[PDB]
């Protein structure tokens, strides 16, 4: 019997079942003996007993490994490096930039008068002026900034704060003349105005051009996991109580629908958008704010037929609005709408690129249209003439990674933050000119604890089960031998058109260095890496393609002697938890360790909790007889293998006790079912629970994850 | 656009 056992007991309800309609079988009665664990922690002693017993059990196993502390100290020392964003020009004639001196809980906002920016981000420190220090907001540094928008006048700054990481927030307002001071004690937000906008679940704030107020989306007053219902658009006037905010839109008929508004840069036109699922399709309306008082008494005109396409404002020129849209263009395009001829529809300005996903369109230096394409699992910046749509060439085409682009239509320059698996963040300045532009290196992030020249990222292609060519990035020390001995950390997502882009994580390079490991990112189907068709081949009845791509990546690494067959660790979060639990179910013999973060695992019950019903466009509708059949085949909660052909890998599940985005019940129920199916291991299945994440929490979680992988795969730390 | 589980 394994010395760490036995598992904490978990009450079973042997009578708890639901009957689902099935095209193949007529109906299927599914038993759920852990259905009680769907009741929130707050509302159930049973759920409390489970969380507390499972938490202590995991904490005992993890803290017994001395490498847990070794990892925490290694991570803490190495993470103590200065981090910053690109400069962002604002309407108060300051550049704003995020800064962390190394080990602060949260990023701080700094600023510098435009023209004095050559004095910031030096050996001496951030320079400029401290504007907003989120660390002041709470005692533990758990209250995070969820977003901010400066008023067009530059006198006001609207910002979102989530208390206790809870994914509910309040919106606050402060004067740009009221920066945080370094002398302020923690626990309070001094210098803010009385404005308090409660009951907000996502930050979307749009100021009017008069800087008198802003549109926002909120919910009825409410830790719980019931469906997110009755999203409403409100307009808040600066200085008033929230009780005075004017209702702009509700749709009582469709409580699951999410709604918001965006204004054109000029502030003249308002775009209403509703979504009814996670798909890139909207119900869309346009109002002319010059013709309307703000409220439910506004003259909405239809932009296009509902549920065919998504529309995002990218600019305006009087009555003409620039849209980034997927209308009959799944990889997105740029089209113009004339609000003066709404029946004439959209005119194409930039045609769909059939081999490249259009991620953003923005206007710079008056009439330069800057397009960011995703092609070959990395960003490309294309410059177009705004008037004709004519190509003016590429910039930064030598850099393969991702870009954050900063700059407005009225600015002749941009700041571009470049990053990859190996580049932690270089800020370039690009200055547009009469014929050609000028590129300069502004500032680079430097990591004192690590020699980036020791590492490489390989670009390879491998065939999946069905012969589809899949691209994979492989990060490793240059001096690791491909002799089939190296451990692997293999990370995937596969869904919702979300690309796994080259992304800097110091933690992952330290895993590669300390364990002589490879870090593998297969660009599996479900993402946008090769365009929207890459998502379509990895969703609904084709979700199995995602798991097969990931499995085939592992087999390819073993076959080509990158990795020992006995040291594969896999990792995945949210939708990525469908990936890790399905792959663990379908090929347990491939994997030695499985890390699941905030996992979606019950593919039948997901629609019943918070935002889950929106994911029916991705996974299918489990209450639909045809969809039920293909979902039930892989639903990881329902497909745990019998012991015997199966040695189950060691498995660590991360979750909070309350989480709005993925209800922790997915992890609660799956951990119980795994422990019950495999009561004697031999490899432990553990739930690591936390009762805008802080640096401290991220490192303590990373130290559990890495020390658990080390223990489970028999790795020695080679410091 | 939507509320998606990521990370
Ligand atoms: Na546990
Ligand atoms: Na809104
Ligand atoms: Na396949
Ligand atoms: Na993906
Ligand atoms: Na990374
Ligand atoms: Na796991």
Numbering used by the authors:
A (entry chain A): 3 to 224, 229 to 697, 704 to 731
B (entry chain E): 802 to 808
Paper lines:
OphP is an essential enzyme for the biosynthesis of the macrocyclic peptide natural product omphalotin A. The enzyme has been proposed to proteolytically release a peptide intermediate from the precursor protein OphMA and to macrocyclize the multiply α-N-methylated core of this intermediate to produce omphalotin A. Our *in vitro* experiments demonstrate that OphP does not process OphMA but shows robust macrocyclase activity on pre-processed α-N-methylated peptides. OphP tolerates sequence promiscuity in the substrate but has a preference for highly α-N-methylated substrates and for N-methylated glycine residue at the catalytic site. The promiscuity of OphP is explained by structural analysis of co-complexes which reveals a predominantly hydrophobic substrate binding cleft with few interactions between substrate side chains and OphP. Similar to other POPs, the monomer has two domains, an α/β hydrolase domain (residues 1–82, 453–738) and the seven-bladed β-propeller domain (residues 83–452) ([Fig fig4]).
To characterize the interactions of OphP with its presumed natural substrate, S580A mutant crystals were soaked with a ten-fold methylated Oph-18mer^NL^ (W1-^me^V2-I3-^me^V4-^me^V5-^me^G6-^me^V7-^me^I8-^me^G9-V10-^me^I11-^me^G12-S13-^me^V14-M15-S16-T17-E18) and a seven-fold methylated Oph-15mer substrate (G1-F2-P3-W4-^me^V5-I6-^me^V7-^me^V8-^me^G9-^me^V10-^me^I11-^me^G12-V13-I14-G15) ([Fig fig2]) (both substrates yield dodecameric macrocycles with the underlined residues). Only residues ^me^I8-^me^G9-V10-^me^I11-^me^G12-S13-^me^V14 were fitted to the electron density whilst the remainder were presumed to be disordered ([Fig fig4]). The N-methyl group ^me^G12 contacts the indole ring of Trp621 and sits in the P1 pocket which is also formed by Ile606 and Phe502. The peptide bond of ^me^G12 is positioned for nucleophilic attack by Ser580. The hydroxyl of Tyr499 and the backbone amide of Asn581 are well-positioned to function as the canonical oxyanion hole pair to stabilize the tetrahedral intermediate formed by the nucleophilic attack of Ser580. ^me^Gly12 binds to a hydrophobic pocket formed by Trp621, Tyr625, Val668, Asn581, Phe502 and Ile606 ([Fig fig5]).
